């Protein structure tokens, strides 16, 4: 409905975080971003340049389909934070058993700087098929990018940096190379007293 779901895969939960070990049995976890009436539509040609234009690129993936698998996620990240682990945990569900591949492309000024792949086998669960990417360590680029942002003294300076910083996540059926889900991520700094916020949009032409 308002879910990040295509015809074959559904992302139930997504979250980036910093976990600090206070003592041998105490762990503090800070959530930077988290997912878990109807979805507003967005013209993909408005964000096209912010992502790399190439074979395998966003325009090339959208044009090959299925168009029901494309989303744009606007995140307002919680940066109020002070042993350390930086990680990403995601949960997908499918009605069919598959071997999925989730590729993440970190982009600065539209050009890809970093990329990581994960491959997940289905875990049968109550007639559903689960894919749980549990504590995928955040790359050094991101950890050093979160660090640099925190050094700027005012949030306007921080958002200014994030107007040329995006992430593209392409979850693919490994054997068939079908686009299962393709999420485009844009960021701002949260000012909310209720933690990290987000807006999900369906990408259209």
């Amino acid at each position: 409905p308002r879910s990040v779901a295509s015809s074959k895969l559904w992302m139930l939960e997504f979250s980036a975080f910093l976990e600090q070990q206070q003592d041998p049995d105490t762990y503090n976890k800070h959530l930077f971003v988290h997912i878990g009436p109807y979805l507003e539509a967005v013209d993909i040609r408005q964000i096209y340049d912010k992502f790399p234009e190439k074979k395998g690129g966003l325009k090339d993936l959208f044009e090959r389909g299925p168009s029901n698998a494309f989303f744009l996620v606007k995140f307002w990240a919680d940066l109020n934070t002070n042993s350390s682990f930086y990680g990403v945990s995601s949960q997908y569900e499918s009605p069919e058993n598959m071997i999925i591949t989730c590729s993440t492309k970190v982009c600065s000024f539209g050009k890809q700087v970093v990329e990581k792949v994960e491959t997940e086998y289905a875990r049968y669960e109550n007639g559903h098929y689960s894919y749980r990417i549990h504590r995928s360590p955040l790359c050094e680029y991101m950890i050093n990018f979160i660090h640099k942002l925190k050094h700027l003294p005012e949030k306007y300076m921080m958002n200014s940096v994030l107007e040329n910083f995006t992430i593209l996540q392409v979850v693919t059926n490994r054997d068939t190379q079908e686009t299962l889900l393709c999420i485009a991520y844009v960021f701002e700094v949260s000012a909310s007293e209720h933690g990290a916020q987000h807006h999900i949009y369906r990408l259209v032409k």
Binding site: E40, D43, Q46, W76, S192, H199, Y201
Partner: peptide, 16 residues
């Protein structure tokens, strides 16, 4: 084109 000047819903710039 500035992100605030692009053809995007008003909510894009309005945090929930």
């Amino acid at each position: 084109v500035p992100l605030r000047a692009r053809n995007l819903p008003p909510s894009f710039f309005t945090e929930p």
